[PDB]
RNA sequence: AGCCCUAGCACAGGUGCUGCAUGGCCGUCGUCAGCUCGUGCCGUGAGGUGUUGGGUUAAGUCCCGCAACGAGCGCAACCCCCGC
């Protein structure tokens, strides 16, 4: 149910923050703002769940990334109303392109897991029970999404784009596709997928991010209801 | 045969020169909070980033932040004496 739940309060966002290369993704500048051509968000959408639904339904692995202010908590639920995996916090140097190398983060903060379960659940030179057990807050703090992945993702799906370049960056230096939510903040040419929108509103930021994550299930079965995702939406 | 004695021979011996041919060992900047590597990223390149910044410490000690994420030689800790 898309069509007038997109207008709901979704559709046009900032003014002469812009790149004119986001011209043609624009109703008009009215009012003094950009509102933006609902019609071309639609289009550009079935083109972007097709590529969903298909890396889905191959059975791929979309990597989520949102780490601004409202994205932010939606985004570790819809990945995990999807199975999927997320950057959160803080976009790491070389998520993608030093992965092997971030991994040995993963390898070593489940090496802890096998010691917070342990013979070891009590004891060791007991100034380690802060030393290893605070280090793994900054592992578990950022590795949330990540320690799910095991092989490099199949798309990433970025909320604003401008905000998280250094993704985007990294990404097609591997040649992995780049879905985005973008907006006129944003320069196209480099998303891959387009979801021309807000890339502020959370009423936007929600309203589309979960319904990829129909899509990303609804591609094998046991769709759920409009699920965990209100955080305090006022 | 050994071992000894004189006549030879091969050799020994030299605190004789070169620390600007060396090894080892010491002193010094200085117990100063520094000096680097792996991979990623930026740069045509020498290189840079990391190691800069804000707070904090005796300290590159820790913390928050960040195209970096970690590691090695250091610092601290593991040893000795002194206090209960
Ligand atoms: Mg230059």
Redesign the pocket.
């Known amino acids: 149910v898309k069509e007038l739940l997109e207008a709901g309060v979704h559709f046009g966002h900032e003014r002469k923050r812009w790149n004119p290369k986001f011209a043609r993704y624009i109703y008009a500048e009215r009012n003094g703002i950009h509102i933006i051509d609902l019609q071309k968000t639609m289009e550009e959408l079935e083109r972007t769940f097709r590529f969903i639904e298909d890396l889905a339904m191959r059975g791929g692995t979309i990597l989520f990334v949102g780490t601004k202010k409202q994205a932010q908590d939606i985004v570790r639920m819809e990945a995990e109303r999807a199975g999927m995996p997320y950057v959160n916090?803080?976009?790491?140097?070389?998520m993608?392109?030093?992965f092997?190398?971030?991994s040995?983060?993963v390898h070593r903060l489940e090496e802890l897991e096998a010691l917070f379960a342990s013979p070891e659940i009590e004891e060791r030179p007991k100034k380690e029970q802060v030393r290893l057990k605070?280090?793994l807050?900054?592992?578990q703090k950022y590795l949330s999404g990540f320690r799910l992945l095991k092989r490099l993702p199949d798309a990433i799906f970025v909320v604003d784009p401008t905000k998280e370049a250094?993704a985007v960056?990294?990404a097609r230096?591997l040649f992995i596709p780049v879905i985005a939510l973008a907006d006129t903040d944003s320069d196209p040419d480099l998303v891959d997928y387009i979801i021309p929108g807000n890339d502020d509103a959370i009423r936007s930021i929600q309203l589309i991010l979960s319904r990829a994550v129909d899509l990303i299930i609804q591609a094998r079965g046991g769709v759920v209801e409009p699920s965990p995702s209100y955080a305090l939406v006022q």
């Open positions: 916090q803080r976009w790491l140097g070389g993608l392109t030093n092997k190398t971030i040995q983060r605070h280090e807050e900054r592992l250094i960056r990294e230096k």
